[PDB]
Amino acid sequence: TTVLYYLPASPPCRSVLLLAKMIGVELDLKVLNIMEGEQLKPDFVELNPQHCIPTMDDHGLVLWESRVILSYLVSAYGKDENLYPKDFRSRAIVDQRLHFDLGTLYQRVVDYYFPTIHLGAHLDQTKKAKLAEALGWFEAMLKQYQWSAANHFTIADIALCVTVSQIEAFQFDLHPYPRVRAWLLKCKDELEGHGYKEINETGAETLAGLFRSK
C-alpha cells in the first residue's frame, strides 16, 4: 500500500486514483482538507515544502505532482498494460502531452474557473478564449493517433481525461471540438470499469457544483 494525501474533488488527485485503481495499486488514503487548511500544518509542510496534494509516500519515497506520480506508479507497479511506453521515442510524445496538460490545458482551466470557485470572482471572457484556444491545440493534437499521444491508452489520456471531463462538467461548450468529444467518450468507456464514475464523475460534479454554487 502506498500513502496518498488527497482530496476527492481535486482533479490532480483523481488522476492518481484512476491510474492506481487501473493498475491495482492499493492506496492508504489520507484526506487533506485544503479548504480548512490542513495542508499548512508543520508535519505536512515538513513532508512537502510546497504543501500540496496529491502527495505520495511510497514506503518512505515522498513525491508530489500528480503527473509525476502517474509515471512513477506505472514504472513501479505497472504490468501487462503499457500506460507508459518504454521506447523513448514514444514516451516523449506521452511526456509532451502530460506537460501540455500541466503547463497549458489544465493551467488555463484553473485560470478561468477556480477564482470564481475560490473567491466568487467574475468569469473573464479573455481567459475563456485562451482555454478555447488550448482545446483547439488539443483538437489538432488528436489527429495523429487514436488516443492522445499513442495509438493505445496511456497515462496522458488519464491526466487529460480528468482535465477535459472537468471542463465538460463546467458545461463548457465542446461542440467545436469533435475529436476531443470523440476521444473523451473512449476515455470514459475505457475507465468505466476502473472507478471512473465512483472516482472522477462524482468528483467533477461536486467541483462543478462548487463553481455553479456560491
Ligand X SMILES: N[C@@H](CCC(=O)N[C@@H](CS(=O)(=O)O)C(=O)NCC(=O)O)C(=O)O
Closest CA to 54 of 79, 91, 19, 84: 19
In the shown chain, the binding pattern of residues 113 to 152 toward Cu ion, with x for contact by CB under 5 A and - for none, equals ----------------------------------------
Q: HSE on the CB side for 92, CA within 13 Å? A: 4
| All cell numbers assigned to 25 | 495499486
Q: How far is the CB of 103 from Cu ion (least distance, A)?
A: 26
Cβ-based neighbours of 3, under 8 Å, separated by 6 or more = 27, 28, 29, 30, 56, 57, 58
* Closer CB to ligand X, 66 or 200, in the complex: 66
**Beta pairing, strands 27-31 & 2-6:** parallel
Binding site partner of 72, from a copy of itself, ligand X, Cu ion, none, Cβ cut-off 5-8 A by kind: a copy of itself
Beta-sheet strands, E only, within the chain: 2-6, 27-31, 55-58, 61-64
Identity of the amino acid at 43: D
Q: Which does 1 bind (CB under 5 to 8 A by kind): ligand X, a copy of itself, Cu ion, none?
A: Cu ion
Q: Measured from the CB atom, is 113 or 177 closer to Cu ion?
A: 177
Where along the sequence are the contacts to a copy of itself (CB under 8 A)? 49-50, 61, 63-65, 67-68, 71-72, 75-76, 88-89, 91-93, 95-96, 99-100, 102-104, 107, 136-137, 140-141
- The site for ligand X, by CB under 6 A, has a size of 15
C-alpha cell at 1: 500500500
As annotated, the active-site residues are 10
Q: Please state, in angstroms and as integers, the Cα–Cα distance from residue 166 to each residue in 35, 69, 77, 101, 161, following that order.
A: 19, 20, 27, 13, 8
Q: Please choose, out of 10-18, 90-98, 137-145, 166-174, the segment that lies near ligand X by the rule CB under 6 A.
A: 10-18
Of ligand X, Cu ion, a copy of itself, none, which one does residue 76 interact with (CB within 5 to 8 Å by kind)? a copy of itself
CA-based nearest residue to 162, from 2, 6, 18, 8: 18
Among 197, 206, 212, 214, binds Cu ion (CB under 5 A): 197
Q: How far, in Å, CA of 206 to CA of 133, rounded? A: 26
Segment contacting ligand X by CB under 6 A, of 52-60, 83-91, 140-148, 198-206? 52-60
Which positions touch Cu ion (CB under 5 A)?
A: 1, 195, 197-198
